[PDB]
């Protein structure tokens with residue numbers, strides 16, 4: 589699963605950033621963020637900051 | 641300000657030798673076998689730099705504690721010795737609680753969710769302990785008991 | 791064992807709250823309250839490690855040491871706040 593089938597002859601290794609697509613045939617990166625402003629595991633620091 | 645500059649020089653030195661890369665390529669953790677969730681985002685703030693900062697803070701805390709226990713003979717008007725030692729110990733406890741959770745979750749998921757959150761929580765807890773149990777008794781005496789203010 | 795330790799400690803610090811207010815004759819009252827407060831801080835800081843270090847690379851090498859350090863600190867606060875002033879007074883005379 590670390591490689592994507594670029595051609596029917598053999599699978600090809602994808603770059604360090606992208607991960608293989610669900611139905612093979614290439615790979616596309618999916619960006620992520622540092623929790624953004626979401627509720628999970630951010631309410632506690634935000635509260636201890638605002639009340640402080 | 642001289643004490644601040646003593647660490648500001650080191651901050652500048654570390655900034656120069658080790659610039660803030662802020663690389664988005666934080667793919668060190670990679671669950672590529674399921675190929676479902678992968679990737680991470682984090683600043684380049686180093687664990688060694690954090691350790692150096694905490695060491696400087698702990699040294700300052702030790703000097704504060706030795707000073708507090710040296711100046712214990714001051715009367716009750718300026719007796720800022722027991723609260724200061726208590727605050728030093730509370731900050732030490734907070735940082736000693738921060739160390740295991742921060743330095744143990746290395747080869748595990750949600751490393752960004754754990755490390756940054758626990759670091760900022762520890763910083764906020766130390767600041768809250770210091771501010772509250774340093775000044776809040778005084779504010780209480782001032783504006784809740786207007787009789788000892790003279 | 792941890793829960794029974796916190797139970798004994800909670801009764802101890804509850805008796806310490808009612809202790810607060812006694813005259814200066816009882817020398818070992820305010821130090822007792824301070825020791826209870828320090829133990830309160832230590833055991834309140836211990837729990838985040840307890841429910842935070844789980845599901846990590848080292849689930850065994852940190853759980854057996856965090857409790858050990860907490861126990862050592864809970865002994866050290868009592869030692870320092872109940873015998874260090876006694877030792878200092880002894881050194882005076």
Ligand SMILES: O=C(Nc1cccc(Cl)c1)c1ccccn1
Pocket residue numbers: 733734736737739740832833835836839852855856857859860863
């Ligand atoms: O876990 C703690 N302190 C620590 C710090 C570094 C390494 C290790 Cl083994 C332990 C701790 C501190 C305070 C209260 C409860 N627990």
